[PDB]
Design an enzyme around this catalytic site. Sequence first.
Site, PDB file in Angstrom:
ATOM      1  N   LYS A  96      -3.714 -30.288 -37.198  1.00 16.60           N
ATOM      2  CA  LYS A  96      -4.988 -30.385 -36.495  1.00 16.60           C
ATOM      3  C   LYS A  96      -5.297 -31.815 -36.079  1.00 16.60           C
ATOM      4  CE  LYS A  96      -8.228 -28.335 -38.860  1.00 16.60           C
ATOM      5  NZ  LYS A  96      -8.765 -27.580 -40.029  1.00 16.60           N
ATOM      6  N   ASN A  97      -5.201 -32.750 -37.023  1.00 13.38           N
ATOM      7  CA  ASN A  97      -5.477 -34.155 -36.718  1.00 13.38           C
ATOM      8  C   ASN A  97      -4.507 -34.696 -35.677  1.00 13.38           C
ATOM      9  OD1 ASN A  97      -7.586 -34.398 -38.635  1.00 13.38           O
ATOM     10  ND2 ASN A  97      -6.100 -34.777 -40.279  1.00 13.38           N
ATOM     11  N   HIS A 136      -1.716 -25.253 -46.242  1.00 13.87           N
ATOM     12  CA  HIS A 136      -2.976 -25.982 -46.178  1.00 13.87           C
ATOM     13  C   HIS A 136      -2.730 -27.426 -45.741  1.00 13.87           C
ATOM     14  CE1 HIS A 136      -7.223 -26.737 -47.336  1.00 13.87           C
ATOM     15  NE2 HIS A 136      -6.773 -27.959 -47.555  1.00 13.87           N
ATOM     16  N   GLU A 174      -3.764 -28.966 -41.941  1.00 12.43           N
ATOM     17  CA  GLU A 174      -4.704 -30.071 -41.832  1.00 12.43           C
ATOM     18  C   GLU A 174      -4.122 -31.206 -41.002  1.00 12.43           C
ATOM     19  OE1 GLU A 174      -7.856 -29.995 -42.665  1.00 12.43           O
ATOM     20  OE2 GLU A 174      -7.833 -31.827 -41.427  1.00 12.43           O
TER      21      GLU A 174
END
EC number: 2.7.11.2
Lengths: 355, 355
Positions: free
Chosen positions: A231-232, A224, A228
């Site tokens: 992606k950023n 997780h 995250e």
Amino acid sequence: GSAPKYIEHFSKFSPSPLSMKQFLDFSNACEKTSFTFLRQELPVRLANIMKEINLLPDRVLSTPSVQLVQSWYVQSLLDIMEFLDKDPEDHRTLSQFTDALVTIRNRHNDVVPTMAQGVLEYKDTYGDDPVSNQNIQYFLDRFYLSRISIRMLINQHTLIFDKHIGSIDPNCNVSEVVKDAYDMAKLLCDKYYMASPDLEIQEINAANSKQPIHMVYVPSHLYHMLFELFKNAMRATVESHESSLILPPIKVMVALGEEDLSIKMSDRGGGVPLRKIERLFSYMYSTAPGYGLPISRLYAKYFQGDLQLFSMEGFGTDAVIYLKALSTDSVERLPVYNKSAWRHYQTIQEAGDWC
Amino acid sequence: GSAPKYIEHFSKFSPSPLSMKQFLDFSNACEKTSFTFLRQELPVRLANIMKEINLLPDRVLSTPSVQLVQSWYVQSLLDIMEFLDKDPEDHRTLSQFTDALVTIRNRHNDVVPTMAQGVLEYKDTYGDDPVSNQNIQYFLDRFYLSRISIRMLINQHTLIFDKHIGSIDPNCNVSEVVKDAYDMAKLLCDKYYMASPDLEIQEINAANSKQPIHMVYVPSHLYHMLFELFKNAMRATVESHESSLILPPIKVMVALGEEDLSIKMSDRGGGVPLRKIERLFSYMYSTAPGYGLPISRLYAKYFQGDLQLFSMEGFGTDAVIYLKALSTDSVERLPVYNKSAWRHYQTIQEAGDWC
Ligand SMILES: C[C@@H]1CN(C(=O)[C@@](C)(O)C(F)(F)F)[C@@H](C)CN1C(=O)c1ccc(C#N)cc1
Ligand SMILES: C[C@@H]1CN(C(=O)[C@@](C)(O)C(F)(F)F)[C@@H](C)CN1C(=O)c1ccc(C#N)cc1
């Protein structure tokens, strides 16, 4: 009509933070042993968080959001009371429980989006000032960590009593989980932008120069956080180089020291001003018109770790996840209701100490 | 016998935070104009910090250290009162001042070591617990920033009234200041260890790809921060590789974005556990049996910047200095005495909100 009573009761107990090795000791290290434990623990944890909610502005309390989830916990609390007078031994008394858990878990599956809605309701209803931000930040951090810890227990029970001990991998290969989060982000990045940066990984096993880096952890939690961040880092590398042809890779380093296991993800996506970074982990300011970062960080902290960011405007950003290397040091980070937690909501800010 | 009175008076005023461009506007942009300004400002700043001291435990107050410096400020305050009724025009009334400033500056030259002594006195006299650490941290941060801001004004006056405007370089070449701090640390590292890592620098001028990176800043302040970091990065790179022959270099990146000018210094000196990093900027825990880091950070914050650390245990450490790129945004960060600052000393901690 006794919810307030139960909550008043179990609210007197403090939750029992468990270590990752106690989790490793547990098919049939007796679920009887678990059932009896979870019978008191879940109610104690549910009640402490329920007790803290009841003590926040009625302005926040009265919203459909807070009352909607507040009614979900009330029902889950009652949902488990049933078993307080039950006796194990009955191979069906404890399956009534495993089902009672799977049913409670799904009842709370949308608490995050639901709670985010309340944040927006608040922003538009009362405004977005520092004290509001602070109180929301303080409460959502605790509420969410509380939730994470409750789901951990539930998943450990449901999974173990249907190599891995529940959702725990005693030989988690960090670099493999890195690659997985990457592949997934890449696939999404490719669909949406039709271009994506590559990945370089490097390991530094301080004590054992070449042995692959393994640790005892909850892979899905680590996935997780990494997903995250990828992606950023992907969105920014792609968008900041829309007129460049080159497209640098995202570099990740996994370092294992005596007590820390650190993962750094470096991108060259333009970077962000120091002033905005501080706002990237705030639930209030990151709400519109997601909560990947603030929540990814709670997952890091849940077992005494952390997640930090530092970029260079005009260049890139480093994101680092700090986890404990020893299962001995990986103990649940739980919020508790005390006279201590009470005064964090007495913020009467108006004119600070600096000019 | 009117010190308490003067302090009660000027303590009612708030200090006036100045921007770096207002500093650039000022040989003879009228020191009359400055004299009259400094006549009220210095007393206001001295009184606010003096007012905050007087309100800390008498246990801290009664120590020779705190009373020694507390008596230094009392004398400096009186030292400048003299000029309140004076009239400029008199080319000797304002030279009585420049001397009065040089004399006050030197009177406070050893406040840091002196105050550090008080910290030790406290550790051994009352113990080193979190609440003590917190209150000391809170107060020393403000006290020291207060001092930095007072010395800034004094140096600007004394230097300007004996290319550069006082201690301000309107065309400060960051990379040159980097090299200087490096050379100095290297020289010391060579004497003490007879081996030292090299230096690599790289610039990223976002908006103007090859123009050297310049900024309006106080070079000596930047040199201080960089020198402190180079020393730590050198000590650790050398000591962690005492059995290696290779000796990696210390890499520095200077990046200039729209509003931020960032300097990252990366070393491969072994790194430090997350838990100890948090203690590296604490005056209490970093005292024995120096304060380079905690104070270097106040220098960063003084003009709205920051100084952060993040390492990877078993690998190395990154230290980053964040400064504002625009002189417009470089405004003094000053602590002020209000009802707000008062309650930060009412910490009655005993049993937290987490378990
Ligand atoms: C039975 C409890 C809880 N537990 C579990 O693995 C689970 C699967 O049941 C769960 F994840 F759901 F928690 C171990 C940490 C062993 N264990 C304990 O070691 C324990 C801890 C505290 C107490 C108390 N008081 C009693 C037992
Ligand atoms: C004269 C003041 C102070 N000053 C100076 O350069 C110094 C050398 O005198 C010193 F560093 F010591 F401060 C400029 C920022 C101009 N200036 C102002 O612009 C100013 C600021 C606030 C007020 C007020 N109230 C009046 C004037």
